[PDB]
């Protein structure tokens, strides 16, 4: 059944959209309502939560619009717009994860200067510049979607930012391991080596598993469109979109929910609402 396009129940798209919507809303509310959570790292987490909310809402909206139109000019402008929103939001999500990784690299490798570098003014400038560039790129990538240049630029940006994220986290891990080696050599003395390896495994594995199939799809979309096996692989586009939305639902649990303050704020908000 590879030749036929895999059809996914709309209900699944609307369910993932609503659940991830509520979760990212809770993230942004918990940050806005807890004055202590105003460091640059939480502004970057907020930006990520916003991008994930946009991915889930835009895909849920497109799903509902398609379903309603199918049950029953305008189609081109609607489709043309929703897609520019989705592309911009996906670029913003990837850029937000990169900004978090960079932020953390700075703190670990610029511990004494960090506060003289990541000033709130600069955090606001960086976030606004990222969002503006992502919106503009999403618009240009949809207006000229029928061109190899757009797909090539999308796979280049993805794989450059994947390599950067993996490099930054591997370097921080190696520094943590060096500290472990020095701490353990004392006259008075899972484990830290396992906790660190698990943290890297989750942080990189989730990103790669939930994103990469889509960009592999685009790679085949330029390289081998007519090949009998690549056609079968491309039949799962509707599943690769679900994996991407599943990153929108998962990511808050590996960044926003690791901090104790955000957990406390979540639990108070949940009991209030």
């Amino acid at each position: 059944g590879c030749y036929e396009q895999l059809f996914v129940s709309p209900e699944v798209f609307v369910t993932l959209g609503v659940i991830s919507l509520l979760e990212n809303i809770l993230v942004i509310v918990a940050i806005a309502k807890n004055k202590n959570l105003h460091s640059p790292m939480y502004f970057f987490i907020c930006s990520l939560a916003v991008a994930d909310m946009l991915v889930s809402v835009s895909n849920g909206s497109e799903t509902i619009v398609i379903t309603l139109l199918n049950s029953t000019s305008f189609t081109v402008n609607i489709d043309n717009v929703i897609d520019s929103v989705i592309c911009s939001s996906l670029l913003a999500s990837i850029c937000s994860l990169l900004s978090i990784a960079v932020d953390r690299y700075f703190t670990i490798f610029y511990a004494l200067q960090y506060h003289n570098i990541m000033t709130v003014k600069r955090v606001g400038i960086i976030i606004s510049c990222i969002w503006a560039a992502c919106t503009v790129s999403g618009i240009l990538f949809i207006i000229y979607s029928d061109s190899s240049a757009v797909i090539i630029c999308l796979i280049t940006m993805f794989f450059t930012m994947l390599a950067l994220m993996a490099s930054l986290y591997v370097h921080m891990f190696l520094m943590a391991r060096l500290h472990i080696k020095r701490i353990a050599v004392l006259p008075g003395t899972q484990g830290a080596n396992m906790k660190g390896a698990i943290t890297l495994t989750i942080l990189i594995g989730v990103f790669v598993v939930c994103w990469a199939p889509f960009f592999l799809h685009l790679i085949f979309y330029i390289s081998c469109p007519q090949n009998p096996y690549c056609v079968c692989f491309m039949s799962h586009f509707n599943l690769y979109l679900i994996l991407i939305m599943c990153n929108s639902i998962i990511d808050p649990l590996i960044y926003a929910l690791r901090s104790q303050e955000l957990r406390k704020t979540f639990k108070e908000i949940i009991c209030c609402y």
């Binding site: 609607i78 489709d79 897609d83 586009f237």
Partner: peptide, 7 residues
Amino acid sequence: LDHXRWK
């Protein structure tokens, strides 16, 4: 229309 684009 469709799901995303390049589908």
